[PDB]
Amino acid sequence: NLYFQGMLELRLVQGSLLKKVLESIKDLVNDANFDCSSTGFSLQAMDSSHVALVSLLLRSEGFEHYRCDRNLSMGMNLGNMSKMLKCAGNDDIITIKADDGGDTVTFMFESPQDKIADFEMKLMDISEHLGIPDAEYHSIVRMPSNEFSRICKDLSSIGDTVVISVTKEGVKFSTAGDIGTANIVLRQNTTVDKPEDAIVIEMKEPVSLSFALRYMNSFTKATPLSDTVTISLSSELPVVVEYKVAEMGYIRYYLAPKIEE
Amino acid sequence: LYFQGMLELRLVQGSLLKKVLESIKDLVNDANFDCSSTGFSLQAMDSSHVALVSLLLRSEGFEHYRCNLSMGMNLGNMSKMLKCAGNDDIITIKADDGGDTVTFMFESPDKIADFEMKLMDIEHLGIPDAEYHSIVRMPSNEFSRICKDLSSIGDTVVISVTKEGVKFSTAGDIGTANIVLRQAIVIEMKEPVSLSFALRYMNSFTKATPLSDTVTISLSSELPVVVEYKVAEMGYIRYYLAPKIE
Amino acid sequence: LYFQGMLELRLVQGSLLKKVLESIKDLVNDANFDCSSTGFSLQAMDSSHVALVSLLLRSEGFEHYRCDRNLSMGMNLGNMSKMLKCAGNDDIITIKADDGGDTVTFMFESPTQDKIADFEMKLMDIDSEHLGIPDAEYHSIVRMPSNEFSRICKDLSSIGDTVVISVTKEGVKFSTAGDIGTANIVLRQNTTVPEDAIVIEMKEPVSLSFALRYMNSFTKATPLSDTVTISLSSELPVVVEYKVAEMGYIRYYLAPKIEEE
Amino acid sequence: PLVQTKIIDFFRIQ
Amino acid sequence: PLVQTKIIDFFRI
Amino acid sequence: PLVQTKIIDFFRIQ
């Protein structure tokens, strides 16, 4: 066949992964295209204020079955998709099915029980993607995702803006608000038996930038996907906050800084 | 011989009574609790007369059972008092026939608590002893999960039983959903049956789920659906829901 | 010898301080922490002057106890609580302040991470107008599981506003009445269980009435101690005491409701 | 157009 | 209705 | 005062 209509069919044995992926992006991005390519099943979208960007990839080798006839895009209301995936059991096998310019997407949930559920959602017509540069960052911090999540929630109780600075002393998160000021300093620490417990700091040049904590706290919705989080900083770029998706991909969040007028 | 009627019930598994009240207090606002030799029962409808609850706690499950009395009860009030009982407490109920009040005693296997609240003065329907076209027994947890999931998609569930299995279907603004379970999950099908029901009421029925790990759904093209939860090994709560029809 | 008064307290079990603040921040808005050789203490009345809280963290419970003079720190307890909520439950907490200083510093050290957090908060000027508590003789004392006492206060308060507490040879009885009906809960001595014991010393029968609203604020100290002690005399406020590990206490004093004469 | 029936359409008043 | 007493009725400054 | 920059200030439209 050559005049085939594009078609997508994905069978993911660990359905819980896809549920956690949607929970990681649905509050940041309302509607977006899921893109289909040889490499895998991906999404790139900004938040509605254009302050943050999410770039997501689920690689083809993580699916039990991976058909991506040509380069489909599925225009998806992420909240509606999330609502349908919330009906999958954490141990369900999940199958996504859609036609190139099709009007609906079908989700199949199969239990490993003789229970089979079919959910059918309307698609939307959605676009223009940004080019992400392959830059060299001035500093990279890797740390346990739960520790970063705790730090962001704690500081956000004190103020709205966090200064992240990397120096020879370590990584410092600072905030000031109506009730006082807070400074949290992590130094490099690899004195651990499990490397995902480490705090690793690689500084090529010192860097200090300011960011809205509200966005940082939405990023930490991806914590259940990844024992680890990597924060990449340079004074000329958004910060990058990267989570692993099991062993089959990633979610990267980019956040534009706050700067003096 | 000319004595005033008296009810005294002692239930060692007091938590069953707590769970029973939670199962029904949001469906029915007030109802009579009826007293008979068979046991402690209740029948009542919701305000729109679309759903009916029939409850029975058999006499054999009370360590003490003394009783044809009725107690008109504000169910949410009774639940406010029962909520003050510990989950392991022994619970006693005591009342007089035309009595003003009911006393609940919560007894720890030290602590002894007495709660007393006012009664009310509150016409039953006859439940035909009919045979059903299809009966499904399934985990109450899975039924509760299905009703909640579908109700996030639409307002109306189609339940159908065929040779293939039992299906639950809904359609709503954001899309459509079908859930098929094949024959534990037991299906006994005299004749295929398919009926529509309001998920709002089904969702209310699943508040009985902590009473039993299994739920039973009886269907007939000519009857309300019956959703039954066993009350430990000493009784039942049966919910009847009138269908939506052509 | 002409030293500036300093305060520096290091507490290994930081969580004790987190729970202490949760125990009092809703009863009292602003209060002085006082610094003596005996320990770190606080006394304050609620704004209606019906309840009084007295707490003591003894100097021996602190890994480092520096309290240079008769120093007082005036503080908004809700703000302090908000800062202490950012301490992990196993964090080591250090408080540092100057006698007439403008701010107080809380340092949170992780015992296992190499994370150091500095939180700084404004102090305020509060007039120390302290009441002397006489060393009096109680007519009855009751010790019981804190969770049992808390359950009783919540259950009764859903029935009515006022609890009658009585001790007799039969035991301790709690009673309330309201719109929906009446409730009596009787507890008898039970030592054949250890923190689940009920222990009652009755020198003379006592019976007094209290507002449940205040009792329910007292039970916010429940996570401090698996037990609680209630001391009654016909001539005194009731005293409700929770132990702070084995390094001190919080004592709540509540004036009774009495019959008019 | 489905119509919601009533319990009293099926059971009588004993 | 009972009368709520105050801490100041029992303890002195 | 600080100003919130945008992603569009940094990345091109590809």
Side-chain angles (χ1 to χ4, degrees), chain C residues 48-65 67-68 71-81 83-84 86-95 97-106 108-112 114-115 117-121 123-124 126 130-134 136 138-153 155-168 171-187 189-195 197-202 204-219:
Chain C
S48 72
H49 302 302
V50 158
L52 169 82
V53 62
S54 183
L55 71 103
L56 172 66
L57 307 193
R58 299 172 199 280
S59 46
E60 320 87 66
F62 290 94
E63 161 146 280
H64 180 255
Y65 189 79
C67 181
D68 279 10
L71 171 160
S72 306
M73 299 193 309
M75 265 191 15
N76 185 293
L77 292 170
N79 290 354
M80 178 168 180
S81 196
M83 292 203 158
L84 279 297
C86 305
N89 272 307
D90 286 325
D91 278 358
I92 298 153
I93 301 187
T94 290
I95 304 167
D98 277 333
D99 189 324
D102 316 303
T103 74
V104 53
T105 289
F106 309 103
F108 311 147
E109 278 171 52
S110 166
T112 53
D114 202 345
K115 166 183 174 191
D118 254 29
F119 287 64
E120 194 168 331
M121 193 187 109
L123 297 175
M124 54 201 291
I126 298 167
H130 284 143
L131 311 180
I133 291 154
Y138 294 120
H139 295 168
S140 293
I141 309 173
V142 174
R143 186 235 301 165
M144 66 175 78
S146 50
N147 55 47
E148 189 66 71
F149 177 64
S150 177
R151 176 81 193 261
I152 285 171
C153 289
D155 295 348
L156 291 186
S157 69
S158 81
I159 304 297
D161 299 336
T162 299
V163 57
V164 188
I165 308 173
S166 304
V167 182
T168 63
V172 57
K173 178 201 229 141
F174 306 84
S175 304
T176 191
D179 296 355
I180 205 191
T182 62
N184 306 281
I185 302 154
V186 180
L187 305 171
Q189 167 139 337
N190 172 24
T191 57
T192 176
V193 302
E195 64 258 46
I198 311 281
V199 173
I200 297 168
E201 184 191 64
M202 177 188 84
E204 333 178 9
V206 201
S207 176
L208 280 171
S209 290
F210 305 93
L212 276 158
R213 148 198 304 254
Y214 297 95
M215 293 292 192
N216 278 125
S217 58
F218 299 169
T219 61

Side-chain angles (χ1 to χ4, degrees), chain A residues 20-26 28-29 43 45-56 143-146 148-152 156 160 162 164 173 210-226 228-233 237-243 245 250-258, chain F residues 4-7 11:
Chain A
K20 299 180 201 206
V21 162
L22 261 301
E23 293 292 301
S24 304
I25 67 175
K26 84 198 190 65
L28 201 57
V29 173
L43 177 149
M46 285 180 291
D47 84 297
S48 68
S49 270
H50 309 85
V51 170
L53 172 82
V54 64
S55 172
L56 171 163
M143 75 176 81
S145 51
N146 45 94
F148 174 68
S149 178
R150 170 73 145 149
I151 281 162
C152 292
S156 86
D160 295 342
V162 62
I164 310 181
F173 303 81
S210 292
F211 300 104
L213 276 159
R214 190 199 84 180
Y215 284 92
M216 290 294 198
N217 284 123
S218 36
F219 301 165
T220 69
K221 285 163 178 342
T223 302
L225 281 163
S226 179
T228 279
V229 68
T230 297
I231 304 168
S232 308
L233 299 138
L237 283 180
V239 62
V240 196
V241 177
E242 176 170 332
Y243 296 87
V245 175
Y250 58 81
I251 307 188
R252 292 172 190 148
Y253 302 99
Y254 301 71
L255 175 52
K258 324 227 270 177
Chain F
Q4 176 60 76
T5 65
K6 303 300 174 108
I7 292 289
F11 302 160

